[PDB]
Amino acid sequence: SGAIYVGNYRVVNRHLATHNDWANLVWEDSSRDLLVSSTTAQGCDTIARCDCQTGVYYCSSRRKHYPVSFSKPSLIFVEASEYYPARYQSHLMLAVGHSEPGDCGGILRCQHGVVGIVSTGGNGLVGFADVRDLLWLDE
Ligand SMILES: CSc1ncncc1CC(=O)N1CCC[C@H](C(N)=O)C1
Ligand SMILES: [Zn+2]
Structure with missing residues (x-):
């Protein structure tokens, strides 16, 4: 959450x-x-407006923050779950890090502010939904 x-x-x-x-x-x-x-x-909170690809996220299943290197926002296939059919999720950034069901909503931050939130994961990966392109959040 x-x-x-x-x-x-x-x-x-x-x-x-x-x-x-x-x-x-x-x-x-x-x-x-x-x-x-x-x-x-x-x-x-304040929102980052940048192209950082490193940052720190909060992992609720470990009560700890971890540093990550993450990919640029992109269209990534996500398997079917109880919440969505199998589909491509857009504006998603992947990184190597721990995550399990319950960790969605954890914030990813860089030196500029909030980058996004945990949205997907599995087998040593963690995926973040980017929010840096939503310029209207600031006004
Ligand atoms: C941190 S979530 C997680 N972590 C590890 N293993 C399984 C998961 C679960 C997961 O990836 N999803 C289920 C909830 C909807 C997500 C979506 N954005 O489509 C996909
Ligand atoms: Zn940044």
């Missing part, structure tokens, strides 16, 4: 969005596993 809180927006994994997220929907994209909802309180 986990979310990004920026300005009057909350960014979550679309597959983990609550009834309240859907009732306050701003934008969602099943191909990216992202959903953004509106909030009344001002957020705590």
Whole structure:
């Protein structure tokens, strides 16, 4: 679990969005596993606007942060799960690192701010949904 809180927006994994997220929907994209909802309180986070390919992510299944080298955002095949059919997920970045079900929502940060959130994983890989192209989160 986990979310990004920026300005009057909350960014979550679309597959983990609550009834309240859907009732306050701003934008969602099943191909990216992202959903953004509106909030009344001002957020705590800032978003990176960069091309970093290294950073640090929070891994809730280890209660620890780990450094990662990750690929540029791209279209990646993701196997069927209870949440989605087998499909290509867009704007996804892969890295070698631990992840297990329950870790989605962990934040990836570089020196510039928030890069994205954990969205996929398996067998020593971890995949992050990029948010750096969503320029409207800042205004
Ligand atoms: C950190 S998630 C994880 N980690 C390790 N092993 C399995 C997983 C589970 C996983 O990859 N998915 C299930 C939930 C929907 C995800 C999606 N974005 O389509 C795909
Ligand atoms: Zn950066």
